[PDB]
Amino acid sequence: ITGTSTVGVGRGVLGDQKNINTTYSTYYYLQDNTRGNGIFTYDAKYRTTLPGSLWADADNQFFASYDAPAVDAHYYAGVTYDYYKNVHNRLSYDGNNAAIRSSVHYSQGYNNAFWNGSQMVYGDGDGQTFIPLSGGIDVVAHELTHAVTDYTAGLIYQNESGAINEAISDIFGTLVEFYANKNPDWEIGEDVYTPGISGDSLRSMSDPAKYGDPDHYSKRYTGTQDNGGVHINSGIINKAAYLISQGGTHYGVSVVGIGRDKLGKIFYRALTQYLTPTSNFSQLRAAAVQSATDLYGSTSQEVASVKQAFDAVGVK
Ligand SMILES: [Ca+2]
Ligand SMILES: [Ca+2]
Ligand SMILES: [Ca+2]
Ligand SMILES: [Ca+2]
Ligand SMILES: [Zn+2]
Q: Which residues bind Ca(2+) 1?
């Protein structure tokens, strides 16, 4: 809507207070005009019809429990936009400042979040397995990254290309978490997963096997569930990414870490310049090697570490 840009204050899912960009026109709306063509947050009102109603508030104060998921979805979408713009020089997910839209309070007790090809959607969780999903910055960044992938590589959501699609979202979801410096780690969804159990998460990049996910190509899932194991086999790539950044010895292969910043630069280049809709793991390795070569030289330590990481997880 058309109005005056202002700043409101609220409390997120985890009870933390933060300022959010809103727009004033009779009501205060969750519409941030400071980033590209805007960031819009909608209320799905426990229904499944999207996007729902643009979030309207009477006093620009969002401290009600019902407001929490909206506050975080709105705020973290902004942080993610800032990451791509400041670190990778990318304006929004399409590279042309496309408006970012999110709907919260989707359905009832919905334990999931997703990008539906046009916008992000967040469930509130059942309160046991998950609390409102927008409370996790790595979750929000994971979802927005699916949009980036759709507009660039276009990796098909099935089998190996789908596992890569998933890993990319986990990787950048994690890099954004580090960017915001919000208790950063290499685990996925720890902030909103099982509120009754501390120390766990949905997936782990440092040690995928911790939750039964493969950490080597020889242990890849070949079944048909989960679209050919897109959330399962992503563990193989997540481990490779973790090794490239942090280093370590995996299955007898030693990898010298090159840091998070270079990891992000290498994968972003691979994603936007070399990957295609049907790229498989082996092609991802070639793309990553070529990207590191473009950026640091064929005889650089960076290129060496990328090769070692993929050798470590058995991807030739
Ligand atoms: Ca209010
Ligand atoms: Ca964390
Ligand atoms: Ca995390
Ligand atoms: Ca937990
Ligand atoms: Zn995903």
A: 57, 59, 61
**Is there a catalytic annotation at residue 302?**
no
**Biggest alpha carbon–alpha carbon distance for the chain:** 64
Q: Which residues of 97-121 are buried (b: 16+ CB within 10 A; e: fewer)?
A: bebbbbbbbbeeebbebbbeeebbb
Ligand 4 centroid – CA 81 distance (Å): 27
Determine whether the annotation assigns residue 166 to a binding site.
Answer: yes
Q: In what order do the strands lie in the sheet with 4-11?
A: 56-57, 27-29, 17-25, 4-11, 61-62
Given resolution (angstroms): 1.9
Determine whether 143 is an active site residue: yes
Would you give the DSSP letter of residue 151? H
Q: Please state which CATH number belongs to domain 155-315.
A: 1.10.390.10
Task: Quote the ligand 3 centre to 241 CA distance (angstroms).
Answer: 14
Q: Cα separations (Å) of 236 from 68, 175, 202, 241, 262?
A: 34, 18, 15, 9, 19
Neighbours of 94 (CB within 10 A): 15
As assigned by CATH, the class of the 6-154 domain is: alpha beta
Residue spans per domain, the chain? 6-154, 155-315
Single out the catalytic residue among 143, 160, 216, 302: 143
Experimental method: X-ray
